[PDB]
């Protein structure tokens, strides 16, 4: 029902929308699943008060559709509000995207990192050594001996 209010041009209604696009994101997940995808419109519209949160709710909504590269590029472009939460059933959904894509990227970066290297985001490598500090600090080292191999570093 909040799909209708997308021609306002007062962007405060759009931030009122993304106020409703995060907390109850599962029942209208059915409703707006493929219909409207104007996240990039206000995410790129210089009426910013919605960009650093906008790619979060897209990274929520496309997940059960699949779209791991859609919610992965929006996971990188989602900024600080994305990775600030790890007390959910969603950090396992996103590190299985980003760490896997990072290490299968680093297979190519074990092949040819010199020349045509890829624009690795600082969060794309930042939650790698951050979650690796979760490995070192959460007392497990038969895995912390392992992800250090997995990053090919």
């Amino acid at each position: 029902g909040i799909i209708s209010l997308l021609d306002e041009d007062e962007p405060q209604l759009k931030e009122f929308a993304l106020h409703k696009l995060n907390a109850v994101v599962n029942d209208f997940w059915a409703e707006i699943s493929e219909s409207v995808d104007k996240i990039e419109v206000l995410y790129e519209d210089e009426g910013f008060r919605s960009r650093q949160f906008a790619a979060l709710v897209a990274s929520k909504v496309f997940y059960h559709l699949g779209a791991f590269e859609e919610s992965l590029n929006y996971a990188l472009g989602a900024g600080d509000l994305f990775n600030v939460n790890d007390n959910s059933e969603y950090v396992e959904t996103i590190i299985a995207k980003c760490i896997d894509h990072y290490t299968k990227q680093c297979v190519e970066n074990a092949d040819l990192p010199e020349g045509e290297k890829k624009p690795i985001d600082q969060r794309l490598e930042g939650i790698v050594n951050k979650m690796f500090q979760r490995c070192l600090d959460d007392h497990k080292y038969k895995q912390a001996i392992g992800i250090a191999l997995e990053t090919r570093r």
């Binding site: 038969k142 392992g146 191999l149």
Partner: protein, 102 residues
């Protein structure tokens, strides 16, 4: 350890992948090899052929003939014969030495 539990378990996915391709190869190779030996059996059937008469069969693919030499015999078959072309007083062909159905 847990780190070997995934790498050594995809190791048998690489080891697992080849084998269906292998039986895929042998699937046709036993056919094309099978048709070679399929015709190969009729070297016994060629010229120097003696004649008996079919009498009855004990079982599947082993029977009893009556030779035109007068004496009866317990003989073997040849497999490619339609068995439904027999059972009356069938005039049959016998190998002159091995003495089996031809």
């Amino acid at each position: 350890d847990l780190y070997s539990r995934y790498k050594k378990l995809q190791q048998e996915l690489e080891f697992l992948e080849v084998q269906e391709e292998y039986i895929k190869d042998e699937q046709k190779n036993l056919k094309k090899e099978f048709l070679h030996a399929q015709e190969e059996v009729k070297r016994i059937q060629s010229i120097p052929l003696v004649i008996g008469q079919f009498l009855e069969a004990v079982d599947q693919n082993t029977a009893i003939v009556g030779s035109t030499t007068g004496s009866n015999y317990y003989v073997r078959i040849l497999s490619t014969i339609d068995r439904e072309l027999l059972k009356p007083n069938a005039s049959v062909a016998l190998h002159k030495h091995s003495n089996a159905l031809v």
